[PDB]
Amino acid sequence: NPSNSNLQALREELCTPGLDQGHLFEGWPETVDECNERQIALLTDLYMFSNMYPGGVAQYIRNGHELLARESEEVDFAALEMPPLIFEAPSLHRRTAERTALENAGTAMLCKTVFVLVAGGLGERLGYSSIKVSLPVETATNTTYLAYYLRWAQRVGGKEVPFVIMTSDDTHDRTLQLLRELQLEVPNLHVLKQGQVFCFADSAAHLALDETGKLLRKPHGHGDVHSLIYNATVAQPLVNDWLAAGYESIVFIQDTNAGATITIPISLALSAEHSLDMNFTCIPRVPKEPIGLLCRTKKNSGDPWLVANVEYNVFAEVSRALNKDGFSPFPGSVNTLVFKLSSYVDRLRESHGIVPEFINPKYSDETRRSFKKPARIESLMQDIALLFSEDDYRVGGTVFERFSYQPVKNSLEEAAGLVAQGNGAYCAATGEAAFYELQRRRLKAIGLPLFYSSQPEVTVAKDAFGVRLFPIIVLDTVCASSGSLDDLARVFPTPEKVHIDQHSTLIVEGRVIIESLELYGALTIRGPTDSMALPHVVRNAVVRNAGWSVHAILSLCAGRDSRLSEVDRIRGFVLKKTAMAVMDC
Ligand X SMILES: O=c1ccn([C@@H]2O[C@H](COP(=O)(O)OP(=O)(O)O[C@H]3O[C@H](CO)[C@@H](O)[C@H](O)[C@H]3O)[C@@H](O)[C@H]2O)c(=O)[nH]1
436 annotated ligand binder:
no
Nearest approach in angstroms of CB 477 to ligand X is 21
Nearer to ligand X, 280 or 548 (CB): 280
Nearer to ligand X, 61 or 225 (CB): 225
132 annotated ligand binder:
yes
389 annotated ligand binder:
no
Nearest approach in angstroms of CB 110 to ligand X is 21
Nearest approach in angstroms of CB 120 to ligand X is 3
Nearest approach in angstroms of CB 187 to ligand X is 23
d(CA 191, CA 194): 10
Contacts of 221 (CB under 8 A, 6+ apart): 378, 379, 380, 381
Nearer to ligand X, 82 or 537 (CB): 82
Nearer to ligand X, 296 or 503 (CB): 296
120 annotated ligand binder:
yes
Nearer to ligand X, 435 or 492 (CB): 435
Residue type, 415: A
d(CA 526, CA 535): 10
Alpha-carbon distances, residue 143 vs 312, 410, 530 (angstroms): 31, 20, 19
311 annotated ligand binder:
yes
Nearest approach in angstroms of CB 313 to ligand X is 9
Helices (H), 81-207: 97-109, 145-157, 172-182
d(CA 143, CA 137): 6
Nearest approach in angstroms of CB 225 to ligand X is 7
154 annotated ligand binder:
no
User: Is the bond preceding residue 471 a cis peptide, omega within 30 degrees?
Assistant: yes
> Does residue 449 sit in helix, strand or coil?
coil
List of residues contacting ligand X (CB under 6 A): 118-121, 123, 132, 166, 168, 194, 219, 221-222, 254-255, 291-292, 309, 311, 333-335, 380, 407, 409
Nearest approach in angstroms of CB 474 to ligand X is 23
Question: Closest by alpha carbon to 63, among 378, 381, 386, 388?
Answer: 378
Residue type, 455: Q
Nearer to ligand X, 335 or 504 (CB): 335
> Does residue 138 sit in helix, strand or coil?
coil
312 annotated ligand binder:
yes
Nearer to ligand X, 238 or 514 (CB): 238
Query: Which residues of the chain come before a gap where C and the next N are over 2.5 Å apart?
Result: 234, 325
221 annotated ligand binder:
yes
Q: Is the dihedral of CA 67, 72, 77, 83 positive or negative?
A: positive
Question: Closest by alpha carbon to 486, among 96, 147, 72?
Answer: 96
453 annotated ligand binder:
no
Nearer to ligand X, 67 or 478 (CB): 67
Question: What is the phi-psi region of residue 252: left when phi exceeds 0, alpha when psi lies from -120 to 50, beta otherwise?
Answer: beta
CA angle 576, 581, 582 (to 5 degrees): 120
254 annotated ligand binder:
yes
Nearest approach in angstroms of CB 403 to ligand X is 15
Residues flagged as binding site for UDP-alpha-D-galactose? 118, 120-121, 194, 221-222, 254-255, 292, 311, 333, 382, 409
Residues flagged as binding site for UDP-alpha-D-glucose? 118, 120-121, 194, 221-222, 254-255, 292, 311-312, 333, 382, 405, 409
Residues flagged as binding site? 118, 120-121, 132, 194, 221-222, 254-255, 292, 311-312, 333, 382, 405, 409
